[PDB]
Design an enzyme around this catalytic site. Structure first.
Site, PDB file in Angstrom:
ATOM      1  N   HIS A  64      57.972 -15.648  62.968  1.00  0.00           N
ATOM      2  CA  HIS A  64      57.549 -15.283  61.629  1.00  0.00           C
ATOM      3  C   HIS A  64      56.101 -14.790  61.645  1.00  0.00           C
ATOM      4  O   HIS A  64      55.234 -15.409  62.275  1.00  0.00           O
ATOM      5  CB  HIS A  64      57.713 -16.473  60.687  1.00  0.00           C
ATOM      6  CG  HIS A  64      57.041 -16.302  59.361  1.00  0.00           C
ATOM      7  ND1 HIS A  64      57.275 -15.218  58.541  1.00  0.00           N
ATOM      8  CD2 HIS A  64      56.163 -17.093  58.698  1.00  0.00           C
ATOM      9  CE1 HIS A  64      56.557 -15.336  57.441  1.00  0.00           C
ATOM     10  NE2 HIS A  64      55.881 -16.471  57.506  1.00  0.00           N
ATOM     11  N   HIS A  66      53.169 -14.583  59.531  1.00  0.00           N
ATOM     12  CA  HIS A  66      52.801 -15.313  58.337  1.00  0.00           C
ATOM     13  C   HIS A  66      51.789 -14.619  57.433  1.00  0.00           C
ATOM     14  O   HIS A  66      50.650 -14.388  57.823  1.00  0.00           O
ATOM     15  CB  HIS A  66      52.282 -16.693  58.717  1.00  0.00           C
ATOM     16  CG  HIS A  66      52.053 -17.573  57.538  1.00  0.00           C
ATOM     17  ND1 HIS A  66      52.695 -18.780  57.373  1.00  0.00           N
ATOM     18  CD2 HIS A  66      51.274 -17.404  56.443  1.00  0.00           C
ATOM     19  CE1 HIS A  66      52.318 -19.318  56.226  1.00  0.00           C
ATOM     20  NE2 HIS A  66      51.454 -18.504  55.647  1.00  0.00           N
ATOM     21  N   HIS A 109      54.092 -17.449  64.396  1.00  0.00           N
ATOM     22  CA  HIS A 109      54.653 -18.661  64.958  1.00  0.00           C
ATOM     23  C   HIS A 109      56.168 -18.630  65.019  1.00  0.00           C
ATOM     24  O   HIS A 109      56.825 -17.931  64.240  1.00  0.00           O
ATOM     25  CB  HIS A 109      54.165 -19.910  64.197  1.00  0.00           C
ATOM     26  CG  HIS A 109      54.579 -19.958  62.764  1.00  0.00           C
ATOM     27  ND1 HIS A 109      55.796 -20.455  62.357  1.00  0.00           N
ATOM     28  CD2 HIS A 109      53.925 -19.595  61.635  1.00  0.00           C
ATOM     29  CE1 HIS A 109      55.881 -20.384  61.042  1.00  0.00           C
ATOM     30  NE2 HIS A 109      54.754 -19.876  60.580  1.00  0.00           N
ATOM     31  N   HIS A 111      59.694 -19.520  64.117  1.00  0.00           N
ATOM     32  CA  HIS A 111      60.251 -20.030  62.884  1.00  0.00           C
ATOM     33  C   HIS A 111      61.687 -20.506  63.139  1.00  0.00           C
ATOM     34  O   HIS A 111      62.585 -20.288  62.316  1.00  0.00           O
ATOM     35  CB  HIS A 111      60.150 -19.000  61.746  1.00  0.00           C
ATOM     36  CG  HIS A 111      59.959 -19.617  60.392  1.00  0.00           C
ATOM     37  ND1 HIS A 111      60.841 -20.532  59.860  1.00  0.00           N
ATOM     38  CD2 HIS A 111      58.994 -19.442  59.456  1.00  0.00           C
ATOM     39  CE1 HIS A 111      60.424 -20.904  58.663  1.00  0.00           C
ATOM     40  NE2 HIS A 111      59.306 -20.256  58.393  1.00  0.00           N
ATOM     41  N   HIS A 393      52.199 -32.182  50.460  1.00  0.00           N
ATOM     42  CA  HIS A 393      53.049 -31.141  51.051  1.00  0.00           C
ATOM     43  C   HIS A 393      52.550 -29.726  50.738  1.00  0.00           C
ATOM     44  O   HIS A 393      52.556 -29.310  49.577  1.00  0.00           O
ATOM     45  CB  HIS A 393      54.495 -31.276  50.557  1.00  0.00           C
ATOM     46  CG  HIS A 393      55.081 -32.639  50.759  1.00  0.00           C
ATOM     47  ND1 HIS A 393      55.492 -33.096  51.993  1.00  0.00           N
ATOM     48  CD2 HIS A 393      55.318 -33.646  49.885  1.00  0.00           C
ATOM     49  CE1 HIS A 393      55.954 -34.329  51.869  1.00  0.00           C
ATOM     50  NE2 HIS A 393      55.862 -34.684  50.601  1.00  0.00           N
ATOM     51  N   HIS A 396      54.821 -22.974  51.116  1.00  0.00           N
ATOM     52  CA  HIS A 396      54.619 -21.580  51.491  1.00  0.00           C
ATOM     53  C   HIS A 396      55.760 -20.766  50.898  1.00  0.00           C
ATOM     54  O   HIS A 396      56.928 -21.153  51.013  1.00  0.00           O
ATOM     55  CB  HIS A 396      54.662 -21.462  53.009  1.00  0.00           C
ATOM     56  CG  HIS A 396      54.566 -20.062  53.515  1.00  0.00           C
ATOM     57  ND1 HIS A 396      53.691 -19.133  52.985  1.00  0.00           N
ATOM     58  CD2 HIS A 396      55.197 -19.442  54.537  1.00  0.00           C
ATOM     59  CE1 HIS A 396      53.795 -17.997  53.651  1.00  0.00           C
ATOM     60  NE2 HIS A 396      54.705 -18.156  54.599  1.00  0.00           N
ATOM     61  N   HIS A 398      57.471 -17.096  51.297  1.00  0.00           N
ATOM     62  CA  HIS A 398      57.541 -15.888  52.124  1.00  0.00           C
ATOM     63  C   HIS A 398      57.607 -14.626  51.256  1.00  0.00           C
ATOM     64  O   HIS A 398      58.070 -14.664  50.107  1.00  0.00           O
ATOM     65  CB  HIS A 398      58.763 -15.955  53.029  1.00  0.00           C
ATOM     66  CG  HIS A 398      58.623 -16.918  54.168  1.00  0.00           C
ATOM     67  ND1 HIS A 398      58.828 -16.548  55.481  1.00  0.00           N
ATOM     68  CD2 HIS A 398      58.320 -18.239  54.193  1.00  0.00           C
ATOM     69  CE1 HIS A 398      58.651 -17.595  56.265  1.00  0.00           C
ATOM     70  NE2 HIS A 398      58.333 -18.630  55.510  1.00  0.00           N
ATOM     71  N   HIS A 448      59.238 -23.259  51.389  1.00  0.00           N
ATOM     72  CA  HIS A 448      59.362 -24.539  52.086  1.00  0.00           C
ATOM     73  C   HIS A 448      58.030 -25.221  52.396  1.00  0.00           C
ATOM     74  O   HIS A 448      56.964 -24.583  52.379  1.00  0.00           O
ATOM     75  CB  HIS A 448      60.119 -24.337  53.392  1.00  0.00           C
ATOM     76  CG  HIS A 448      59.406 -23.452  54.355  1.00  0.00           C
ATOM     77  ND1 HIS A 448      58.578 -23.945  55.342  1.00  0.00           N
ATOM     78  CD2 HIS A 448      59.378 -22.104  54.472  1.00  0.00           C
ATOM     79  CE1 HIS A 448      58.065 -22.934  56.019  1.00  0.00           C
ATOM     80  NE2 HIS A 448      58.546 -21.806  55.519  1.00  0.00           N
ATOM     81  N   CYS A 449      58.115 -26.514  52.700  1.00  0.00           N
ATOM     82  CA  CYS A 449      56.962 -27.289  53.109  1.00  0.00           C
ATOM     83  C   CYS A 449      56.564 -26.860  54.500  1.00  0.00           C
ATOM     84  O   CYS A 449      57.388 -26.832  55.408  1.00  0.00           O
ATOM     85  CB  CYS A 449      57.264 -28.787  53.106  1.00  0.00           C
ATOM     86  SG  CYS A 449      55.852 -29.771  53.685  1.00  0.00           S
ATOM     87  N   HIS A 450      55.289 -26.540  54.673  1.00  0.00           N
ATOM     88  CA  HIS A 450      54.847 -26.073  55.973  1.00  0.00           C
ATOM     89  C   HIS A 450      54.517 -27.179  56.981  1.00  0.00           C
ATOM     90  O   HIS A 450      54.099 -26.885  58.104  1.00  0.00           O
ATOM     91  CB  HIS A 450      53.720 -25.040  55.869  1.00  0.00           C
ATOM     92  CG  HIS A 450      53.890 -23.901  56.823  1.00  0.00           C
ATOM     93  ND1 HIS A 450      53.906 -24.078  58.190  1.00  0.00           N
ATOM     94  CD2 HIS A 450      54.095 -22.578  56.610  1.00  0.00           C
ATOM     95  CE1 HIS A 450      54.086 -22.908  58.779  1.00  0.00           C
ATOM     96  NE2 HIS A 450      54.204 -21.981  57.844  1.00  0.00           N
ATOM     97  N   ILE A 451      54.697 -28.436  56.582  1.00  0.00           N
ATOM     98  CA  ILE A 451      54.809 -29.516  57.562  1.00  0.00           C
ATOM     99  C   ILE A 451      56.181 -29.329  58.207  1.00  0.00           C
ATOM    100  O   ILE A 451      57.231 -29.512  57.552  1.00  0.00           O
ATOM    101  CB  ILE A 451      54.684 -30.918  56.942  1.00  0.00           C
ATOM    102  CG1 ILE A 451      53.299 -31.099  56.302  1.00  0.00           C
ATOM    103  CG2 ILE A 451      54.970 -31.991  58.006  1.00  0.00           C
ATOM    104  CD1 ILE A 451      53.208 -32.270  55.333  1.00  0.00           C
ATOM    105  N   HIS A 454      59.068 -31.693  58.216  1.00  0.00           N
ATOM    106  CA  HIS A 454      59.698 -31.861  56.907  1.00  0.00           C
ATOM    107  C   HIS A 454      60.733 -30.760  56.653  1.00  0.00           C
ATOM    108  O   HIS A 454      61.853 -31.037  56.217  1.00  0.00           O
ATOM    109  CB  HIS A 454      58.655 -31.931  55.789  1.00  0.00           C
ATOM    110  CG  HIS A 454      57.755 -33.131  55.874  1.00  0.00           C
ATOM    111  ND1 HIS A 454      56.649 -33.289  55.063  1.00  0.00           N
ATOM    112  CD2 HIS A 454      57.790 -34.225  56.676  1.00  0.00           C
ATOM    113  CE1 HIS A 454      56.050 -34.431  55.356  1.00  0.00           C
ATOM    114  NE2 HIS A 454      56.717 -35.015  56.336  1.00  0.00           N
ATOM    115  N   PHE A 459      63.297 -29.796  53.953  1.00  0.00           N
ATOM    116  CA  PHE A 459      62.390 -29.600  52.798  1.00  0.00           C
ATOM    117  C   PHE A 459      62.141 -28.122  52.469  1.00  0.00           C
ATOM    118  O   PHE A 459      61.040 -27.591  52.698  1.00  0.00           O
ATOM    119  CB  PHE A 459      61.065 -30.352  52.986  1.00  0.00           C
ATOM    120  CG  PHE A 459      60.469 -30.881  51.690  1.00  0.00           C
ATOM    121  CD1 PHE A 459      61.227 -30.924  50.517  1.00  0.00           C
ATOM    122  CD2 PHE A 459      59.154 -31.344  51.652  1.00  0.00           C
ATOM    123  CE1 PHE A 459      60.675 -31.420  49.334  1.00  0.00           C
ATOM    124  CE2 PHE A 459      58.594 -31.832  50.472  1.00  0.00           C
ATOM    125  CZ  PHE A 459      59.354 -31.873  49.317  1.00  0.00           C
TER     126      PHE A 459
HETATM  127 CU   LIG Z   1      56.022 -31.906  53.563  1.00  0.00          CU
HETATM  128 CU   LIG Z   2      53.988 -19.948  58.440  1.00  0.00          CU
HETATM  129 CU   LIG Z   3      55.151 -17.064  55.955  1.00  0.00          CU
HETATM  130 CU   LIG Z   4      58.411 -20.277  56.603  1.00  0.00          CU
END
Ligand SMILES: [Cu+2]
Ligand SMILES: [Cu+2]
Ligand SMILES: [Cu+2]
Ligand SMILES: [Cu+2]
Ligand SMILES: *[C@@H]1O[C@H](CO)[C@@H](O[C@@H]2O[C@H](CO)[C@@H](O)[C@H](O)[C@H]2NC(C)=O)[C@H](O)[C@H]1NC(C)=O
Ligand SMILES: CC(=O)N[C@@H]1[C@@H](O)[C@H](O)[C@@H](CO)O[C@H]1O
Ligand SMILES: *[C@@H]1O[C@H](CO)[C@@H](O)[C@H](O)[C@H]1NC(C)=O
Ligand SMILES: OC[C@H]1O[C@@H](O)[C@@H](O)[C@@H](O)[C@@H]1O
Ligand SMILES: OC[C@H]1O[C@@H](O)[C@@H](O)[C@@H](O)[C@@H]1O
Length: 495
Positions: A64, A66, A109, A111, A393, A396, A398, A448-451, A454, A459
């Site tokens: 991905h 980002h 990164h 994905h 949390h 993000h 997209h 989604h949560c970027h942790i 999760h 998540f």
């Molecule tokens: Cu989270």
């Molecule tokens: Cu990202």
């Molecule tokens: Cu992104």
């Molecule tokens: Cu993502």
């Protein structure tokens, strides 16, 4: 230093960024992953050549990019089983896209699952030849990119499901509790010069409280969006966020600590942990400078866009075409959003649409996809809650930048001139972080949560934006069409 046209060869190998040796993921045979650059409006052609042989960290991959809108190129966005099937090992896949109207600091990164924690993650800079802040600094190059990243001695699928970092890496270097002699990163400055530092969180989990001893930081960009300059003595950066700050190297020639305090794990600096070095002629030794208490921290609600751009819609709650509320929960070892937990579908969401899916009810996974109208104003509230442990949390979206009409730690709404960004902390129980964007980009987009641990535990939701125009707006190359038949033929041990 590489890009916008480049090969990215992904492979497995041993790395010791904190003096502890472990198997990980290399990109062009280096760790951490190398910096990619280009200019505003360039075409990026990134040929991802997947040579990974380790199934524990996954042989397959997907990248991905980002922050990039990927308008017309939704097939290139990266999330596995939303936008593409993974690249299978022994194969390559060309990401080919454009960045009209964007410039600032980004990153790339994996994905796929929790793969990016195992080391497939690096910064990207998109330079602006007419950057409105160009005149605020003298230096802006490879040497002014600063990355933060969490590091584990056990791999993502080998450690605990939500692990604790052994080390904070600054520019891919850091110390752990039992490697207090490991090399620290050095950022060099010349006295009297002004520097545009581009700070990017490659984190899989923790947020960092970032500061530089004796120095103030003039923040001029958040998640690739130009700001009015705002001078702080520290800032908090959540997984996947970026800040540009101007540093005026006007202090005495000396060594100064650069500090990045995580919200979990080792929460001190004993022995130079969670640290790098800012070095002016100064001696090649560690700093012995002292942390002064932060009296002017970055506050998200006090950031504004350079232009003062209003939030989309009219200035009242629900003053948009569609307003959604995402109620977080957790049950059966799985995160939920409005009762549904994300599980990767076998047919990627984009392919489902291209294949004739017409509505959210058609789209797998059931309960996890939201249909959004074309050419509209959207408002999404993400009220934080204890039912979703591991807050705050960072969410993000997209394919989009959004207005943060309400920030964590703030009780007020700003529709007139809020900051715009693309990753936002949803804060602590009692918060109601609220965002607005425009549906100007047809395609399915992950929210989604970027942790990452999760996300892995579900998540996430998918924004299916302007379904009727998805296929016509996003013509796919044949190499993309070949991804799923190739991946589905793999036996599970080769995935
Ligand atoms: Cu989270
Ligand atoms: Cu990202
Ligand atoms: Cu992104
Ligand atoms: Cu993502
Ligand atoms: C493939 O990657 C995994 C995960 O990184 C490696 O797992 C290691 O396994 C050994 C032996 O069981 C342990 O001592 C290590 O703690 C594990 N490392 C990590 C980082 O968790 C595995 O060794 C790799 N395979 C090969 C052939 O190198
Ligand atoms: C869910 C949503 O988008 N908006 C809600 C709306 O349903 C209602 O007027 C009220 C209930 O608490 O708060 C706001
Ligand atoms: C958050 O804001 C949304 C939209 O106004 C609202 O519907 C929801 O009830 C709020 N939740 C909390 C916990 O305040
Ligand atoms: O999974 C970690 C394992 O790593 C091996 O190299 C040994 O050090 C084992 O004692 C340990 O259980
Ligand atoms: O009683 C709850 C209802 O109250 C009304 O005043 C509106 O705000 C509705 O949106 C809401 O569902």
């Amino acid at each position: 230093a590489i890009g916008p046209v480049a090969d990215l060869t992904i492979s497995n190998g041993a790395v010791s960024p904190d003096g502890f040796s472990r198997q990980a993921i290399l990109v062009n045979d280096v760790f951490p992953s190398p910096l990619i650059t280009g200019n505003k409006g360039d075409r990026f052609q990134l040929n991802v050549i997947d040579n990974m042989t380790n199934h524990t960290m996954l042989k397959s991959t997907s990248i991905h990019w980002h922050g990039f809108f990927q308008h017309g190129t939704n097939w290139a966005d990266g999330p596995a089983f939303v936008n593409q099937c993974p690249i299978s090992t022994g194969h390559a896949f060309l990401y080919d896209f454009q960045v009209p109207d964007q410039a600032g600091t980004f990153w790339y990164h994996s994905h796929l699952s929790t793969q990016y924690c195992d080391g497939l993650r690096g910064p990207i800079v998109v330079y602006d030849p007419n950057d409105p802040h160009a005149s605020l600094y003298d230096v802006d190059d490879d040497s002014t990119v600063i990355t933060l990243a969490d590091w584990y001695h056990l791999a993502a699928k080998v450690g605990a499901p939500v692990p604790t970092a052994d080390a904070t890496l600054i520019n891919g270097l850091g110390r752990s509790a039992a490697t207090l002699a490991a090399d620290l990163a050095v950022i060099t400055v010349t006295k009297g010069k002004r520097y545009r530092f581009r700070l990017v969180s490659l984190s899989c989990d923790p947020n960092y409280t970032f500061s530089i001893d004796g120095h103030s930081l003039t923040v001029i960009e958040a998640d690739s969006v130009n700001l009015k300059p705002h001078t702080v003595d520290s800032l908090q950066i959540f997984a996947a966020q970026r800040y540009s700050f101007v540093l005026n190297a006007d202090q005495d020639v000396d060594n100064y600590w650069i500090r990045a305090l995580p919200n979990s794990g080792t929460q001190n600096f004993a022995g130079g942990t969670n640290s790098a070095i800012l070095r002016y002629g100064a001696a090649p030794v560690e700093p012995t400078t002292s942390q002064t208490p932060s009296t002017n921290p970055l506050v998200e609600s006090a950031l504004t866009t350079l232009k003062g751009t209003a939030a989309p819609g009219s200035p009242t709650p629900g003053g948009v075409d569609l307003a959604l509320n995402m109620a977080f929960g957790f049950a059966g070892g799985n995160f939920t959003i409005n009762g549904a937990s994300f599980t990767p579908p076998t047919v990627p969401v984009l392919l489902q649409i291209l294949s004739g899916a017409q509505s959210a009810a058609d789209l797998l996974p059931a309960g996890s996809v939201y249909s959004l109208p074309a050419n509209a104003d959207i408002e999404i509230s993400l009220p934080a809650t204890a039912a979703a442990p591991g807050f705050p949390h960072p969410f993000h979206l997209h394919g989009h930048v959004f207005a943060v009409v309400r920030s964590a730690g703030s009780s007020t709404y700003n529709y007139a001139n809020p900051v715009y960004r693309d990753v936002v902390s949803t804060g602590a129980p009692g918060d109601n972080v609220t965002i607005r964007f425009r549906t100007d980009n047809p395609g399915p987009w992950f929210l989604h949560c970027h942790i990452d641990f999760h996300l892995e535990a579900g998540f996430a939701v998918v924004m299916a934006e302007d379904i009727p125009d998805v296929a016509a707006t996003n013509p796919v190359p044949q190499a993309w069409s070949d991804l799923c038949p190739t991946y589905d033929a793999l036996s599970p041990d080769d995935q």
